[PDB]
Chains A and B, each alone.
Chain A
Amino acid sequence: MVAAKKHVPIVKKRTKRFMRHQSDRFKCLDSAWRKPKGIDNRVRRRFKGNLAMPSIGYGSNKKTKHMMPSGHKAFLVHNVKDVELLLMHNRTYAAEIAHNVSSRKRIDIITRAKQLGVKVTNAKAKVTTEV
């Protein structure tokens, strides 16, 4: 038994990103959400068949907020000292090795997390196995 702790089921209220209006048509508008402000904008008045707005009712359950599908919360780790902070929380958190960590330092982190029983999200990036 090495897994996450007993958590209530993760329910995502909406799995699709809120896309900015008319971002599909104009390349200058990024898809990042901007609230419409024209008084005759059909998205703003919320007619049917249009894009929905983000709202606090979409907010995820506070027990399962920030939880990965396995049940863990991601923890950004830069060296071996950061993994040891997860010694008491090896069932709630998972080690996410930062993107600017070298090859050798990753193997030191990956070895340490195995000894501590801490899940690593990216354990096969700059490494390989030699027999």
Chain B
Amino acid sequence: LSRVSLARTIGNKLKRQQLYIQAKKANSRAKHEERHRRRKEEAKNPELKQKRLEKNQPASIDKKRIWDDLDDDSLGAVVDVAELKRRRLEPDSLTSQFPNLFADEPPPVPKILVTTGINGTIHKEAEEIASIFPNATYIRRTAHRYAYKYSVREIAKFAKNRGYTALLVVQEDQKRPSRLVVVHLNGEGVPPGPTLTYTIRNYAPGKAIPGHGRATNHYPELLLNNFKTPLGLLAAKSMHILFPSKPELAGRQVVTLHNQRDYIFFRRHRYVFREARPTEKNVVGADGKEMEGVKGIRAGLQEIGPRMTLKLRRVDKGVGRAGSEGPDAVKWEWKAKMEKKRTRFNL
């Protein structure tokens, strides 16, 4: 029945259903005895269980990832950056295109300004996003309903004069945070750098999370996981530039941005190292299980931050589209044609 559809070969519906019910009872009975005879033979000779497991392994979309089988990096080429250096031994394009993010030494204490969408109503959601990044302040975009309508381009000029490093705008839809626009103001003479707009889909505050906790003013430790492409390395370095470089490693606070299949899962936990409880299993590693040296102690976790899932939609030369003026004004613009195949992961 794997190669034939009973619907397109049996016109009578009721006769087809019984033949499928007889098929389900037959196959489920057959699979049980075949796996039980295998379990009996595995007990005597355990070597064949090792042979069966190494040959027959489950499929993964991550292991079927399609890379651009070519050279070159242009912030639009899907390629493993680390495997390119390893092949070269046997990212210059990013540094030249974005000298400010990938320079030698960042400013020590970044100053961050968070504002809302114009005449927004998400003040409590934006302030909690301001508490995510240390040394961040929240200012509403418009004072009254009938107030002056300041532009993002203006505020980028205003905050750069005052001394801020980045400007964050949280755009709302259905009175919920929906887009995160990250603007890099930089310092001295270099212009306001790249603008990275994201999408905040599953927003949940810490109050909604069961068994949560408060955040202390300690600078968190940054975990930027599973970024491999040239585009991902820019998104990783941009999130790096917002946080302080030296973490206060006494608050035991960790902020994570994990990229699983172009979905940047964001969390904020606080941890403690503790000995493993006797009924608990040791922490395993992939391909090299039973992680050595750390055997028998586990890291507990308690969420203290907002839940959100981000996805990168556009990166611009300057501040927004109106503000990027050259012929390379739009750097990388997400379109749905790129996600046509499920194994194409852009970042």
Residues of chain A at the chain B interface (Cβ within 8 Å): 128-131
B169 at interface by CB-CB < 8 Å? yes
Q: Which A residue's beta carbon lies closest to that of B320?
A: A131
B321's partner among A128, A129, A131 (CB-CB below 8 A) is: A131
Q: Which of A128, A129, A130, A131 has the most CB of B within 10 A?
A: A131
**Chain A residues positioned under 8 Å from B179 (CB to CB):** 128, 130
Within B155-189, the residues touching A (CB, 8 Å) are 169, 171, 173, 178-179, 181
Q: Report Cα–Cα, A131/B169, bound state, in Å.
A: 10
B110 proximal to A (CB < 8 A): no
Contacting pair B173 A128 (CB below 8 A): yes
Residue of A nearest to B319 (CB): A131
Give the A-binding residues of B (Cβ under 8 A): 117-118, 152, 169, 171, 173, 178-179, 181, 197, 320-322
CA distance A128 to B320 in the complex (A): 15
| 16 intermolecular pairs with C-beta atoms under 8 Å apart | A128-B171, A128-B173, A128-B178, A129-B117, A129-B118, A129-B171, A130-B179, A130-B197, A130-B321, A131-B152, A131-B169, A131-B171, A131-B181, A131-B197, A131-B320, A131-B321
Which residues of the other chain, A, contact B197 by a CB distance below 8 angstroms?
130-131
> Which residue in chain B gives the minimum CB-CB distance to A131?
B320
Q: How far is the CB of A71 from chain B (nearest CB, A)?
A: 19
**Closest approach, in angstroms, between the C-beta of A72 and any C-beta of chain B?**
19
Min C-beta distance of A29 to chain B, whole Å: 35
Closest to A127 in B: B173
Closest residue to A124 on the B side, CB-wise? B173
Chain A residues, Cβ within 8 Å of B322: 131
A130: chain B residues within 8 A (beta carbon): 179, 197, 321
Give chain A residues whose Cβ lies under 8 Å from the Cβ of B152. 131
In angstroms, Cα B179 to Cα A60, docked, is 45
Chain B contacts of A128 at CB under 8 A? 171, 173, 178-179
Shortest CB–CB separation between residue A124 and chain B, in angstroms?
A: 8
Cα A99 to Cα B173 with chains together (Å): 19
B313 — nearest CB in chain A belongs to which residue? A130
Contacts of A131 in B (CB 8 A): 152, 169, 171, 181, 197, 320-322
Least CB distance from A128 to B in Å reads 6
Closest Cβ–Cβ distance, residue B159 to chain A (whole Å): 15
CA A129 to CA B141, docked complex, whole Å: 15
In the complex, chain A residues whose CB is within 8 Å of the CB of B169 = 131
A67 to B179, CA, bound (A): 37
Cα separation A130 to B117 with both chains bound (whole Å): 10
Instruction: Give B166 Cβ to nearest chain A Cβ, in Å.
Output: 15
Q: Which residues of A contact B118 (CB under 8 A)?
A: 129
A122 smallest CB distance to B (angstroms): 14
Which B residues touch A129, using CB under 8 A? 117-118, 171
Q: How far is the CB of A120 from chain B (nearest CB, A)?
A: 16
Query: What's the nearest-Cβ distance from chain A to residue B179, in Å?
Result: 8
Roughly how many angstroms separate A37 CA and B152 CA in the complex, as a whole number? 66
